Design a protein around this ligand. Structure first.
Ligand SMILES: O=C(O)CNC(=O)C(=O)O
Ligand SMILES: [Mg+2]
Ligand code: NI
Ligand SMILES: [Zn+2]
Length: 331
């Protein structure tokens, strides 16, 4: 078995190897990359996502989210308070302000220490989940707005023809902006490209051990657990590496820098934070190996997780028993 310790793997495809996206994903899995839940892909030196970022300040963040924390430094939840719209130019200036900027630090480890020590005492503002793309249309390789769709994968593998679309989303981050512990909708893959700015630190639990993280989360967030049988779908809970180590949960960590891709694999729980002002683009995708994960994915039916139009069809076809109850939650 390849990668039996479930380490995060880092790939350096050549420009030739970067032509066929599906083939490269299948290659990485042949080497065991999926066992980690997360992989890094460094693009060939010749590749570029677009020519410059020189004109991005005019993108609108219609609903910036202030991420307010509750709990203790290592075990907290966050709630998203909606703020007034602002442009990316306004948000970047805010991120660079004295109130919100990255503190002085020695290296990524010192910054990680400061994040876990101090996150809860601040409320950074995150521009999340903004439909759009920063890939140039002329970028033919690993262009996250040109991937094969999940609906087309389900049709090729299973013959079924469904409604729905699959488009990318932009994320504008600042110091301390945080992504809570989650897997993807329907336990899909994700791919995330850091277009510019400061790094993103990731934490990940191997898929084969995801239930260990779930059981700890039920112990640490016991009222949330009684409220919903899949409350990590709410994407609000944080647990620090120190707490994960104290409780024996297997995990890995890695820092993504500008110009790099990350892939998350089906049922790979992940969480993380931004080091400073940045912009990422991410989208869900599927392969044949996902189908079985989609069939087994948990679902939030309490009504809090409230997800896309396109997820309806996935539930309806892969999980017809759940359909009914999950749509009671979504209506
Ligand atoms: O970058 C972020 O804030 C969160 N992204 C993801 O969880 C992802 O790409 O799957
Ligand atoms: Mg612009
Ligand atoms: Ni994710
Ligand atoms: Zn729920």
């Amino acid at each position: 078995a390849q990668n039996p310790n479930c380490n995060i793997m880092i790939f350096h495809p050549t420009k030739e190897e970067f032509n066929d996206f599906d083939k490269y994903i299948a290659y990485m899995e042949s080497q065991g990359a999926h066992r980690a839940g997360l992989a890094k892909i460094i693009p060939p030196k010749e590749w570029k996502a677009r020519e410059t970022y020189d004109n991005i300040s005019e993108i609108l963040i219609a609903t910036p989210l202030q991420q307010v924390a509750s709990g203790r430094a290592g075990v907290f939840t966050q709630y998203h308070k909606k703020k007034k719209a602002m442009t990316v130019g306004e948000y970047r200036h805010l991120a660079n302000s004295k109130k919100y900027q990255t503190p002085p630090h020695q290296n990524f480890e010192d910054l990680e220490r400061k994040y876990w020590k101090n996150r809860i005492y601040n409320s950074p503002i995150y521009g999340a989940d903004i439909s759009g793309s920063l890939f140039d249309e002329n970028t033919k390789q690993w262009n996250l707005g040109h991937l094969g769709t999940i609906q087309d994968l389900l049709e090729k593998e299973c013959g079924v023809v469904i409604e729905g679309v699959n488009t990318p989303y932009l994320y504008f981050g600042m110091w301390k902006t945080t992504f809570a512990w989650h897997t993807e909708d329907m336990d899909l893959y994700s791919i995330n490209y850091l277009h510019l700015g400061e790094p993103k630190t990731w934490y990940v639990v191997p898929p084969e051990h995801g239930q260990r993280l779930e059981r700890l989360a039920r112990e640490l967030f016991p009222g949330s657990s009684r409220g919903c049988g899949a409350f990590l779908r709410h994407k609000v809970a944080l647990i620090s590496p120190t707490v994960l180590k104290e409780n024996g949960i297997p995990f890995n960590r890695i820092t993504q820098e500008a110009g790099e891709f990350m892939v998350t694999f089906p049922y790979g729980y992940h969480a993380g934070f931004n080091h400073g002002f940045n912009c990422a683009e991410a989208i869900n995708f599927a392969t044949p190996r996902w189908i079985d994960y989609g069939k087994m994915a948990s679902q939030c039916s309490c009504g809090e997780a409230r997800v896309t139009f396109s997820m309806d069809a996935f539930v309806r076809i892969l999980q017809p028993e759940r359909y009914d109850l999950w749509k009671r939650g979504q209506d």
